[PDB]
């Protein structure tokens, strides 16, 4: 299999960090950037959502969506990190908190970043979610469960959006997010994630 | 366990259809509708997202988000439907197509139905959201010309979500989907005939 990606974009970094966490290695194929994760006119039919990252299997089957690629790669490389949840309850809690972080945090941050009235509304929803996330991190070491999971990769990208893309002073105002972020950003798999340049 | 729900709302019907498919039974607790779409009352802190449906386990743990509730129930009631996918590839394709249908279809249909755009008011965002629904429908129709179901060749949770999405488009947004997209129509005729979808309230779900 091979992973099609652009050089420095949040969607692709979600998969890159996941792969480093589980100790997997997948051949990369670099693509040109189009506009909004987009693929070229001649390359877009390979991707159902029309975007990178794109995982291509040996017979030509392609999987798009960063989380879908991560799920496939989780089963491709034996590992003990259980990033989608170690037991039945954790698997449901991971699903719950992943969708909460994605809808209330990541997607709103994306909308606010690329944008004026909807971008401002999207930014307000980000600001309203941060106290909810901070309160959660005051009573749980990680977002979804007591252990590091894929939700923490997604949350890290979301907070990276908020601080480095939207100029929100998250860490000044929310010490529990800051505690968790300091912890997660120290993990080996997050090094050279491009955080400092990812949201320029 | 207990499932907290309101009487006739799409998010709760997503769980109800799934539970019927896998042959599970869970005690239901009716709640009042609080508008704001699916929002809970002053008891909302038991729900991380503040909405119904809400699953409460025997030990008091609560799980919100319809798909997360379905994932737990799938393991709680052993079944051979493999609604999340039967093997590694199917599980990834389910995840891929579920997210495509949810973002590009269902979520946009919700926003158009309930309606905040680039230098605009709330009405223009609803019109923009409706245009996104219309742009995704050809992609779904082309998929259903090559696959019997949305995510794979087998019925999966994505087809439950697609059914709710197309219900939104036709019965909520007055889009003549079936006239223009015969493969969606074929698939919808097939899925809407399943026993678990009977009495889903389709005719009244989007009033």
Residue numbers in the entry:
A (entry chain B): 1 to 115, 128 to 212
B (entry chain A): 1 to 115, 121 to 212
Give me lines lifted from the publication on this model.
Glutathione S-transferases are a family of detoxifying enzymes that catalyze the conjugation of reduced glutathione (GSH) with different xenobiotic compounds using either Ser, Tyr, or Cys as a primary catalytic residue. We identified a novel GST in the genome of the shrimp pathogen V. parahaemolyticus FIM- S1708+, a bacterial strain associated with Acute Hepatopancreatic Necrosis Disease (AHPND)/Early Mortality Syndrome (EMS) in cultured shrimp. This new GST class was named Gtt2.
The crystal of VpGSTT2 had a monoclinic unit cell with space group P1211, and the diffraction data of VpGSTT2-GTS were scaled and refined at a resolution of 1.92 Å. VpGSTT2 consists of two monomers per asymmetric unit. Each has the canonical GST topology, with a thioredoxin-like domain at the N-terminus and a globular C-terminal domain. The GSH-binding domain (residues 1–81) is called the G-site, while the hydrophobic substrates are bound at the H-site (residues 82–204). The RMSD between the two monomers in the asymmetric unit was 0.36 Å, with only minor differences in the N-terminal domain’s loops and β-sheet 2. VpGSTT2 crystallized only in the absence of ligands. Although VpGSTT2 is an apo structure, a crystallographic water molecule coordinated by the potential nucleophiles Thr 9 and Ser11 was observed. The electron density was clear for residue H2O-300 for monomer A and H2O-107 for monomer B. In the apo-VpGSTT2, a loop containing residues 36–39 moved towards the G-site cavity, causing steric hindrance to GSH binding. The double mutant lacked detectable activity, which led us to conclude that water was the general base catalyst.
